[PDB]
Design a protein around this ligand. Sequence first.
Ligand SMILES: [N+]
Ligand SMILES: [N+]
Lengths: 104, 110, 105, 110
Amino acid sequence: MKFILAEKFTFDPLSNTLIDKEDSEEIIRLGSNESRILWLLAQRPNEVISRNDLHDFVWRDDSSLTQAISTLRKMLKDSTKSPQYVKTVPKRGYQLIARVETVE
Amino acid sequence: MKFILAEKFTFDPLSNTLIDKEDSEEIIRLGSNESRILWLLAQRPNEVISRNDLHDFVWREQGFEVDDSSLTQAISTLRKMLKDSTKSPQYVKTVPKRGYQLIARVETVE
Amino acid sequence: MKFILAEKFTFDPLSNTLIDKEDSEEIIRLGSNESRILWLLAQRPNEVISRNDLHDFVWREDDSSLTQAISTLRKMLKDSTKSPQYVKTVPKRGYQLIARVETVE
Amino acid sequence: MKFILAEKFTFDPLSNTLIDKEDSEEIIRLGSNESRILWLLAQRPNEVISRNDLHDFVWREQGFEVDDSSLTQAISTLRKMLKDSTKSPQYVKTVPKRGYQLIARVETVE
DNA sequence: CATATCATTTTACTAACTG
DNA sequence: CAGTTAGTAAAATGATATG
Ligand SMILES: [N+]
Ligand SMILES: [N+]
C-alpha cells in the first residue's frame, strides 16, 4: 500500500520511502524505525497514538521515540513549532494531522 | 465531532483547535486541559457543570491526578484563548459554589 | 513628618492622609492599616520589605489581610497592579515602594 | 548599583529591571530568579559560573529549595528577556558541564 | 470564603554535546 | 549514532489579587 500525505508526499511503508511532489525524481530513504512510526500514524489517521503504541510497534529509553519523531519531522520538512504533519499531544502521544489517503 | 460556538469559533476537540472566523487562516492551539473543559461544557450547553464533573472528565478520566485549583487555572487559560471577558462573559460564566456554564450558542456540525 | 511620593502625593502618616497635587483641595483619607503600610514602605524607600515586617507593623503577633490592605492602598494611589508606579509586589519576598520618596519639614 | 550590559541594557538588580536603550521608555520587568542569575553573572563578568554557584546564590541563599532544572528554565527565560539567541549568544553562553558565562561587556555605574 | 491572575516550579518533549 | 547535559513547551502548583 502507498499513502498520499498532505497532497505532497507519496509514502511507501514497505520500501521505507518518501517522494516529494516538488522533487519527484528524488527518493527520500527513511530509516526502518521512522518508516514504521509513520506507517502506524497513517494507519490511524488523525488519531492520537500513545507513546506506548508507537514504541511497541518498533521496539520491545522512551527517548528513542522522541528522536525517531524528530528525524521523521526533518524528512517531512515539518516544523516542530507549527506542525503540518506530526503533532505532539503532551501526556498522550503523537497525532498525524496531515490529510492521509491510501492508493492501491 | 465539531462545534460552532457563538457563531464565531469552530471547535474541534479531536484536534484541540479553535478557528476564529475573523482570521480563518490562523488556527488557535488549545492545550488538552482547556480543550476537554470546553468539550464537556459544549456537550451540556447552557447547563451549569459542577467543578467535580469537570475535574473528573478533564483529568481523572485521563488518569491524571491534580489539585482542584488546576481547574480554575485552566478556565482562566480557556477564557484568554476565547478572548472572553471575565467581568462580562460571552462564553464561559462562573456560578460560584456550582461550577461553570457555557452561555454561548452551541451547534454541532458532526 | 510628611513624604512626597513620585512628585505627586503629599503623605502624612500621622493624620492618615494623602493629597494629590492635581486635586490639591481634596483630602484622601486612608484607613489606619493602609497608612501604616505606606509609612513603613516610605521609611525604607526602594527596599523590599518582607510580608512579615509589613504585617507586624500593623497587626498582632490571615496573611491575606496584608494582601487586602495593599489592594486598598493601590486604589487610593491610583496605582496599576499590572504596571506599578508606587507599590511593587516582590513574589515570595514582600512589597517594595518604587516611587521617588522625599521627606519634607 | 546598576550595570550596563553590551552597551544596550541598563540592569538594576535592586529593582529587577532591564532598560533597552533602543526603547528607553519601556521597562523590561525581570522575575527575581532571572535577575539574581544576571546579577551573579555580572559580578563575575566573563567568568564561567558553575551551576552550583548559581543555584546557591539564586535560590538557596534566599531560603528556596528547588531542583537543578529550575536553573535551566530560569536561564531560558532570562535569554528570552534579553532577546539572546541560544544558538549564537551575545549575552549568556553555556559551557556544558561547567555552567554559564556572561560574555557581554559589563560596566558598573557609580 | 471562592475564584482569578500571575509567578514559580516541575514535568514532558526536544536538541546539543562528547566516548 | 549513546548516554549525558541542556533547551523549550506544557502542566501543575504556589503566591498574590479580586469579588
Ligand atoms: N504568630
Ligand atoms: N524562573
